């Protein structure tokens, strides 16, 4: 009896009637047998929506919004709101200057997104993305928490969605939140949004330009376990694009300390980041040196063991540091002065894989540029193992070209051969025939270091004679006319010495 009567009073033509009928319907929604009666009525639900949608009074809105909000606390009531076309209307209400009305709408949508199938497609037609982002400037931290969590549900697995947020200026709005407020539940969800965006390749640079790197570094030592982990996955994703930002001297300090932790997911994420920000930046390379970065890193590899997802990033981080800058010398000396040479040569041997072995040969080349390391590296027994790897690669995977393993290995022996002791060892391994064969490579790089190592060994009578006996005179003459001043200068030297 009741329902059929209220439905009619909900839309006459004279408003006071509709404005006064809304107030009545609103109170019935707080009772159980009333809601059940209201839901199963395909007309009551419809009239309610068009009223909240077309009204012009405040409280009529304040009351109609509350009526739908209560209907959303249960499955049956959601399916009804859905059929009556209530979502397009709900979005419209997201522009009200009334707090109560704004704060309901958003929560009803939140519920629809979480348990009704189809909501996602719909909320996107109504255009709920530009609106939710426009609300990010309010000041109610609890309000924000609900809003940002709505952005994360819609942006997951959808690029069209990440691009609109981006196009509406989401990146330098969220970052602001992170360096202004302290509510934990807000800072957690806002990072969950930033994370999802860091995946694509267009949405990345917008974050680093705002200052997302410095704003995310702030919460690395907070009591929240989940906030510190989401912050870390995210800094690792941006890393390969922040290699030129000034004033990163602050964040680099913290990162180093974070190598010493009980959490091994915190060590792994911290490893890669230091590895990436260390690329081609003389200002970042030095700073890490001043805060004891070398000593800390050597220690990281020691406890890592055979876990190749920790060792790999770290080794690449020592490789960058021992090259191109004012402290590159100090760097090379320190790795030794901190008992690291032993473990470095151990990673060359199996269990290891190609990607890892590649980076260690590169670290070793740099380390040999310091005289004080000639004798040590030999005693650990690197030469005999370096040669062994050269062979198996020559003939032949995992993501590594075998020609790279050959160009690196040769250049390693090239620099070591600066000390007489090493030369006597290298030569006494029937290596010459192979070195001579590399002269025939179509790769100029391999030609320089091949003719280079020969230039070194040839400074000794016996050695020179054995080289000429293989027949290097033939290829060496052709390499004289190379336009590569390196491959040339070296071909003239070997011939001079063996004559």
């Amino acid at each position: 009896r009741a329902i059929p009567e209220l439905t009619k009073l909900l839309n006459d033509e004279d408003q006071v009637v509709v404005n006064k009928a809304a107030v009545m319907v609103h109170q019935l929604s707080k009772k159980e047998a009333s809601r059940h009666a209201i839901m199963r009525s395909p007309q009551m639900v419809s009239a309610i929506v068009r009223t909240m949608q077309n009204t012009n009074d405040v409280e009529t809105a304040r009351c109609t919004a509350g009526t739908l909000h209560n209907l959303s606390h249960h499955r049956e009531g959601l399916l009804a709101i859905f059929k009556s076309g209530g979502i397009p209307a709900l979005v419209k209400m997201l522009g009200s200057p009334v707090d109560s009305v704004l704060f309901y709408a958003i929560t009803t949508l939140h519920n629809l997104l979480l348990h009704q199938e189809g909501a996602k497609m719909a909320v996107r037609l109504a255009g709920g993305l530009q609106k939710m982002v426009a609300l990010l400037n309010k000041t109610n931290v609890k309000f924000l928490a609900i809003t940002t969590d709505c952005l994360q549900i819609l942006a997951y697995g959808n690029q069209e969605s990440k691009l609109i947020i981006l196009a509406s200026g989401g990146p330098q709005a969220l970052v602001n939140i992170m360096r202004t407020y302290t509510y934990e539940k807000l800072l957690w969800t806002t990072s969950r949004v930033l994370k999802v965006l860091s995946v694509c390749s267009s949405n990345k640079p917008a974050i680093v330009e705002a200052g997302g790197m410095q704003a995310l570094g702030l919460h690395l030592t907070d009591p929240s376990q989940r906030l510190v982990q989401n912050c870390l996955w995210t800094l690792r994703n941006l890393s390969d694009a922040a290699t030129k930002q000034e004033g990163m001297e602050g964040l680099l300090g913290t990162l180093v300390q974070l190598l010493g932790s009980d959490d091994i997911n915190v060590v792994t994420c911290a490893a890669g980041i230091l590895s990436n920000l260390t690329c081609n930046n003389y200002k970042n390379k030095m700073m890490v040196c001043q805060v004891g970065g070398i000593e800390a890193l050597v220690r990281t590899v020691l406890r890592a063991g055979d876990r190749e997802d920790i060792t790999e990033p770290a080794i690449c981080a020592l490789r960058h540091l021992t090259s191109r800058h004012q402290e590159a010398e100090m760097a090379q000396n320190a790795v030794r002065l901190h008992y690291g040479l032993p473990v470095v040569v151990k990673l060359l041997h199996p269990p290891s894989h190609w990607p890892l072995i590649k980076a260690t040969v590169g670290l070793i080349r740099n380390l040999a540029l310091c005289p004080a390391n000639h004798a040590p590296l030999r005693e650990q027994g690197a030469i005999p193992r370096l040669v062994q790897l050269l062979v198996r690669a020559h003939q032949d995977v995992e993501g590594v070209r075998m020609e790279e393993i050959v160009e690196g290995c040769t250049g390693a022996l090239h620099i070591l051969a600066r000390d007489v002791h090493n030369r006597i060892v290298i030569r006494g391994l029937n290596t010459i025939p192979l070195f001579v064969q590399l002269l025939y490579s179509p790769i100029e790089n391999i030609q320089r270091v091949a003719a280079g190592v020969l230039c070194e060994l040839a400074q000794d009578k016996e050695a020179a004679e054995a080289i000429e006996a293989e027949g290097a005179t033939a290829p060496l003459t052709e390499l004289l006319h190379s336009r590569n001043e390196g491959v040339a200068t070296y071909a003239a030297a070997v011939l001079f010495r063996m004559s």
Partner: peptide
């Protein structure tokens, strides 16, 4: 020389 690694694509 020093070359980066896009961790977004590895995980």
């Amino acid at each position: 020389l020093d070359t980066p690694i896009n961790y977004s694509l590895k995980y």
